[PDB]
Amino acid sequence: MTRLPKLAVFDLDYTLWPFWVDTHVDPPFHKSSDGTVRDRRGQNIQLYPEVPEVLGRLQSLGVPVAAASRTSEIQGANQLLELFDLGKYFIQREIYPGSKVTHFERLHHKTGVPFSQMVFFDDENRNIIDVGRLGVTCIHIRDGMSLQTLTQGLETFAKAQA
Numbered sequence: 001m002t003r004l005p006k007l008a009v010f011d012l013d014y015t016l017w018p019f020w021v022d023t024h025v026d027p028p029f030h031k032s033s034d035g036t037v038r039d040r041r042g043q044n045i046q047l048y049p050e051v052p053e054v055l056g057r058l059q060s061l062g063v064p065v066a067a068a069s070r071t072s073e074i075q076g077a078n079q080l081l082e083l084f085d086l087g088k089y090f091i092q093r094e095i096y097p098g099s100k101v102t103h104f105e106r107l108h109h110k111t112g113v114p115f116s117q118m119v120f121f122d123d124e125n126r127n128i129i130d131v132g133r134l135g136v137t138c139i140h141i142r143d144g145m146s147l148q149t150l151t152q153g154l155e156t157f158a159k160a161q162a
Contacts, residue, residue, distance in 0.1 A: 002158030005137070007113040008058050009104070011071040011122040012077050012095070015145055016045050016086070020071070027076035029083055037083045046083055048144030055089040057150065068103040068120070070127070098111060100127045104134055119157040120155040121145060 013020045024041040032038050037045040058065050069089055073075050074095050081087040094103035108115055115135040122128055128138045137160045139153040
């Protein structure tokens with residue numbers, strides 16, 4: 001029904017997975033025969049349960065998906081996206097330290113999508129505030145992404161377009 005955003009942006013830590021990739025785990029990671037992803041020490045790395053379906057829904061809706069993360073553990077963040085087979089859903093990934101305003105300026109530049117036509121999900125208040133000043137519809141999340149968080153965010157975006 002209501003207008004869809006032209007770009008859906010997600011942070012990684014506490015958005016797609018319940019931890020800080022630069023703090024709680026020890027890269028590199030690998031896939032184990034028991035169906036899990038493990039870090040160098042043997043910890044069981046998991047995504048928030050509905051993350052695969054969240055990205056799959058955006059894919060079905062034709063909504064371009066991008067990442068905007070401020071972690072220093074860049075290699076590890078990308079490896080996780082690949083091992084969980086989530087990388088295929090992303091058209092662009094901005095993963096590096098610094099003000100997230102820089103990540104969004106590059107997303108804006110390469111996609112051509114105006115800031116007002118973007119929706120962003122992050123748990124970090126600092127980022128919600130910084131990016132919000134750009135006109136992006138920012139969705140402050142808790143307990144990571146879920147289909148409810150996604151669908152409510154899309155409604156919020158639609159409302160903002162009005």
